[PDB]
Ligand binder design. Sequence first.
Ligand SMILES: [Cl-]
Length: 379
Amino acid sequence: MARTTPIERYRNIGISAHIDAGKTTTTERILFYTGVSHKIGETSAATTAFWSGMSQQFPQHRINVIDTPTVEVERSMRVLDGAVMVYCAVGGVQPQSETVWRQANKYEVPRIAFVNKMDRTGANFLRVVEQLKTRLGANAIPLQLPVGAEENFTGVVDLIKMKAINWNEADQGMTFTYEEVPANMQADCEEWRQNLVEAAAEASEELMEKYLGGEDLTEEEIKSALRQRVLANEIILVTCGSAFKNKGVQAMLDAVVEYLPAPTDIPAIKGINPDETEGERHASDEEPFSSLAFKIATDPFVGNLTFFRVYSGVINSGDTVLNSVRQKRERFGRIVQMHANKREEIKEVRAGDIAAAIGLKDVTTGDTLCAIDAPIILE
Ligand SMILES: [Cl-]
């Protein structure tokens, strides 16, 4: 059997937010747009979905949306590869934001932010951006400026393209048109675009010399540079909008593709070998199989669903593997992946992907399931 989506096109993401930021609505919109990704045009532990861009401008990407509400929150940081930090445009950075931010830094998790609720009374995008800097110590770089705020919120400006995004209300924002930046925003957009170009220029000596030399960096140069810096945990890119009003999540999904890491963009997972020496497993189908079980869900029709993240190699239905923590063998039977509106039966799971096994005999959350001939304990 063959791999259908290249590993570099996977995005394992978790959504982190305070209770009042609109996490449930943001997640529901992500699942809505990524469930109809081929029609887009110019409670599961993990849900499989697809995205090819608001304008079908990217090859198809596989997005795994991982539910991420001490050890549990830290395990989730190892299951996802990148995070989307959701903040309220009114409330901004809360005390609980400071705590989750620290777990994210501990596991060096690249992230972008989505400032939601731009249509609510008291919305102030740049105030939230400034709070990310002053309260969390983040080098927060806006990718956009909102068009209006509160009852006047109508869209967002993509600072790189210098175009306003006008989403179609009738089709729930499945389609949109790019418009000229409004005259009353031109000055602010120029200032904030220069801010993001400066951030891009810091990525390499070649780009810095071009920037200081008076030449304009291209959109491709800017995006590659910003991606490098996000992956290196140097900056957090900021998007905004309203999930409920169908204006913003779509552009944030483009940002997930453009700036968040693939399984191959983060360091190889570390573990302990049988002889007590440290080992590692690279994000490759050719490496020996290794995975971490991260959630056990009950189901009244088939029994326990053991959710696992594969870090290396491949596992097929029928394979017998080792639970290295328990020193017991397990044989995989039925494997499934949850989509937004249905469950899909699959026969194999490869490096960088997530799925759930049915009928495993004795697997605890935190257990490593790996190759018998190449044992390792990841957690
Ligand atoms: Cl309001």
